[PDB]
Amino acid sequence: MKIAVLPGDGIGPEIVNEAVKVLNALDEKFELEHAPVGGAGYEASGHPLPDATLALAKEADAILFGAVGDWKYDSLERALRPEQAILGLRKHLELFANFRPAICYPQLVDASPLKPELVAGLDILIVRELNGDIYFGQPRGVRAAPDGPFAGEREGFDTMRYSEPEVRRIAHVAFQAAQKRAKKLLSVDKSNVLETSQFWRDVMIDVSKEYADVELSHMYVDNAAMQLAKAPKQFDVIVTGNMFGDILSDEASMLTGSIGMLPSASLDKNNKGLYEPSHGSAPDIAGKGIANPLATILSAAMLLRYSLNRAEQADRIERAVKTVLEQGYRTGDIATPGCRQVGTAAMGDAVVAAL
Amino acid sequence: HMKIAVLPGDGIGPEIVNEAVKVLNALDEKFELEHAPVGGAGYEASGHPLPDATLALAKEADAILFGAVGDWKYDSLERALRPEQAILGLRKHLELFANFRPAICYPQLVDASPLKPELVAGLDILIVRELNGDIYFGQPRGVRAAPDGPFAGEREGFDTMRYSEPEVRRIAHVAFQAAQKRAKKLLSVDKSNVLETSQFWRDVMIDVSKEYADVELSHMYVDNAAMQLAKAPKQFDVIVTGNMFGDILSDEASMLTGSIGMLPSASLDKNNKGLYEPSHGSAPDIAGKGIANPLATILSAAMLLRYSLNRAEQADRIERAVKTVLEQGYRTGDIATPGCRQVGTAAMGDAVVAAL
Numbered sequence: 001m002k003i004a005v006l007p008g009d010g011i012g013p014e015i016v017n018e019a020v021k022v023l024n025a026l027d028e029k030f031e032l033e034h035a036p037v038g039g040a041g042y043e044a045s046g047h048p049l050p051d052a053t054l055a056l057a058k059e060a061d062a063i064l065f066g067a068v069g070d071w072k073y074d075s076l077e078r079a080l081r082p083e084q085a086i087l088g089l090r091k092h093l094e095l096f097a098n099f100r101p102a103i104c105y106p107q108l109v110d111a112s113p114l115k116p117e118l119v120a121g122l123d124i125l126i127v128r129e130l131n132g133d134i135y136f137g138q139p140r141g142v143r144a145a146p147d148g149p150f151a152g153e154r155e156g157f158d159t160m161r162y163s164e165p166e167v168r169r170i171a172h173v174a175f176q177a178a179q180k181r182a183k184k185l186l187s188v189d190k191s192n193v194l195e196t197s198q199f200w201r202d203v204m205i206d207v208s209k210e211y212a213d214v215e216l217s218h219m220y221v222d223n224a225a226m227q228l229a230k231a232p233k234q235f236d237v238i239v240t241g242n243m244f245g246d247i248l249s250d251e252a253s254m255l256t257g258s259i260g261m262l263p264s265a266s267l268d269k270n271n272k273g274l275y276e277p278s279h280g281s282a283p284d285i286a287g288k289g290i291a292n293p294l295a296t297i298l299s300a301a302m303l304l305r306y307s308l309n310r311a312e313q314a315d316r317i318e319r320a321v322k323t324v325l326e327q328g329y330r331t332g333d334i335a336t337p338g339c340r341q342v343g344t345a346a347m348g349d350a351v352v353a354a355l
Numbered sequence: 356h357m358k359i360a361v362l363p364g365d366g367i368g369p370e371i372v373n374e375a376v377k378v379l380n381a382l383d384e385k386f387e388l389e390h391a392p393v394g395g396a397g398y399e400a401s402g403h404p405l406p407d408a409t410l411a412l413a414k415e416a417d418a419i420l421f422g423a424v425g426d427w428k429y430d431s432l433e434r435a436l437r438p439e440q441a442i443l444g445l446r447k448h449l450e451l452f453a454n455f456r457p458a459i460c461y462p463q464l465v466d467a468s469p470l471k472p473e474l475v476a477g478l479d480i481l482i483v484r485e486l487n488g489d490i491y492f493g494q495p496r497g498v499r500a501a502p503d504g505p506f507a508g509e510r511e512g513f514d515t516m517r518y519s520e521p522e523v524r525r526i527a528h529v530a531f532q533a534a535q536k537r538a539k540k541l542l543s544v545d546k547s548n549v550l551e552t553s554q555f556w557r558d559v560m561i562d563v564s565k566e567y568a569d570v571e572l573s574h575m576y577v578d579n580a581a582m583q584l585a586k587a588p589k590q591f592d593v594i595v596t597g598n599m600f601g602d603i604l605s606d607e608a609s610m611l612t613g614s615i616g617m618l619p620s621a622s623l624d625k626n627n628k629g630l631y632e633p634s635h636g637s638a639p640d641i642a643g644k645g646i647a648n649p650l651a652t653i654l655s656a657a658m659l660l661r662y663s664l665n666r667a668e669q670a671d672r673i674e675r676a677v678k679t680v681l682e683q684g685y686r687t688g689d690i691a692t693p694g695c696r697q698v699g700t701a702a703m704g705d706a707v708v709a710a711l
């Protein structure tokens with residue numbers, strides 16, 4: 001069991017330090033190896049995904065990833081920008097299936113901006129397609145506009161595209177997840193405007209024929225943004241494209257009390273995965289020792305459960321997180337009245353103590 | 356001159372526009388109001404939902420006050436003649452590229468929001484959504500055999516996101532000027548850490564910002580913005596973004612206010628001439644029953660004064676009057692609260708007039 005540990009930029013190192021602390025406190029023997037990624041990759045060898053970092057990730061049984069991004073690197077040419085590291089790991093390792101389990105712990109209901117009755121007992125799974133869409137679609141870039149009223153003018157552009165196999169493989173994953181949960185799947189697209197989305201919807205409906213025990217329904221992304229605020233407990237499994245999943249996921253994280261709570265798994269067809277908190281590198285609080293490590297710690301639990309066949313250890317970590325919340329520990333982003341507010345490292349220590 | 360084309364439309368349209376006109380006529384001002392048929396009323400008058408004479412009036416006027424078009428009785432017309440085609444026609448022919456979507460939440464109506472009330476009571480933010488371009492209209496688009504890539508040959512759907520320099524520049528100007536008429540904070544939202552269209556958007560936004568140093572420009576990625584709207588919508592003043600992202604964020608913000616039916620809307624051109632309309636559109640189930648809520652249309656008329664006719668003080672006066680009638684307990688059926696004074700459309704309009 002080799003884990004590639006790729007902390008990245010910003011709050012990445014301080015939150016991954018806590019996840020590694022928790023893994024090291026299990027009785028289990030892991031082989032952990034660190035490598036630079038993102039701005040850290042650029043600093044080391046001028047590329048956000050150094051060849052040796054990609055090699056390590058390919059070789060490992062799983063990847064524990066922090067976050068990438070820092071404003072001082074935004075001006076670099078596109079291929080060198082930090083976020084190209086996570087896009088590249090997803091694409092090169094064919095990690096096409098992203099899982100974001102939004103669960104509101106009882107203690108954190110009061111931390112959510114929504115009225116408490118809307119999020120108490122909330123448990124939604126977002127399945128997001130991760131290797132296609134307008135995130136990768138060609139052609140893209142800047143050009144003279146080839147046609148239309150503004151022909152000749154400078155113009156930025158990206159191509160949104162989805163092919164049949166790409167939609168089918170993520171559809172199957174989502175339907176399989178719904179079979180094991182509440183037998184409901186909601187597919188989100190923008191099919192009343194976008195040709196790509198109508199194509200998505202058509203393929204999703206075709207795959208639904210094979211899952212007579214799951215009820216498939218559909219929702220436009222603009223309505224889904226409304227409904228995640230209004231009545232998110234209507235959802236059990238949501239499946240959507242790369243771009244729409246990105247947008248809805250951050251909104252959904254508020255349903256758990258904070259973006260600092262939402263873990264994620266990115267799997268290939270063999271359940272080799274990269275596990276990362278759903279959030280970014282949070283440069284506004286980077287190095288300040290206050291970021292919430294719990295999304296990253298819960299991502300390490302998912303790592304054990306889904307790639308390393310260690311479901312019992314994953315349960316141990318999850319029980320430890322639930323215990324520290326019962327005990328009153330909170331980082332600043334999930335503070336609740338009367339809580340014990342702690343920084344990143346003390347929160348990690350508390351999780352370790354509760355194992 | 357201050358000439359306003361009044362295009363009431365169908366069903367609740369005339370009912371609610373009559374109250375906005377009542378409010379305008381109660382001001383000290385000298386407006387030239389001129390009515391013209393649109394939507395189903397356009398079809399009944401001369402066979403098109405946007406008659407030539409109606410478009411000519413809209414072009415000539417300094418602003419347009421528009422109600423709502425559509426009804427069950429028009430839904431059987433051929434597609435090109437349906438009332439809702441007028442909306443598209445006016446936006447295209449008047450080059451209205453800037454969609455103003457206020458998100459406002461009145462304290463009296465705060466329980467309609469899914470948010471805890473301290474986060475949203477008194478919310479007053481503005482989303483400016485580019486309306487004419489983006490991936491919603493970009494060519495090419497359709498379904499094809501994939502031309503290249505890892506899945507070449509497979510059936511594939513596709514769309515093209517694109518924004519040219521003049522398209523971003525003109526929406527940037529409109530948004531920065533709106534921020535000048537407010538708290539001088541503008542947030543631009545994009546996905547420039549992944550999308551080339553978005554980095555291009557950001558670059559042009561920053562170039563225009565050089566002419567508006569009085570306005571504080573900040574940037575946010577669309578996923579963070581969707582979260583921030585739920586977490587703390589009061590942090591914003593004006594938000595500007597592309598068509599698709601704006602569509603999503605504005606609908607989110609409207610749900611977060613709790614009363615999407617109170618919300619005014621506008622579509623503006625490069626001179627800030629606008630068409631001003633309630634956000635809600637038709638309501639066949641209550642059309643002509645005298646109970647539709649006119650407040651969104653009245654608030655649209657206030658927007659009209661503020662952004663097209665250089666009458667910010669009168670706009671403030673109308674917005675003050677709407678706050679007052681809510682404090683006084685007046686409600687139309689859609690926003691009825693326990694112990695309220697429930698009124699129909701006309702009596703609500705009377706109450707706004709009384710509070711001027």
Ligand SMILES: NC(=O)c1ccc[n+]([C@@H]2O[C@H](COP(=O)([O-])OP(=O)(O)OC[C@H]3O[C@@H](n4cnc5c(N)ncnc54)[C@H](O)[C@@H]3O)[C@@H](O)[C@H]2O)c1
Nearest residue numbers: 067068069070086260279280281282291292333548576579
């Ligand atoms: N997969 C990734 O690595 C990933 C994802 C998104 C953004 N990013 C990059 O992250 C950088 C910041 O982007 P952003 O500001 O839009 O998004 P972000 O998610 O880093 O931060 C959004 C907000 O949430 C707060 N936040 C995030 N994680 C937190 C935590 N664990 N504890 C407490 N507060 C937390 C931040 O302070 C900020 O206010 C950019 O460079 C962006 O490209 C990377």
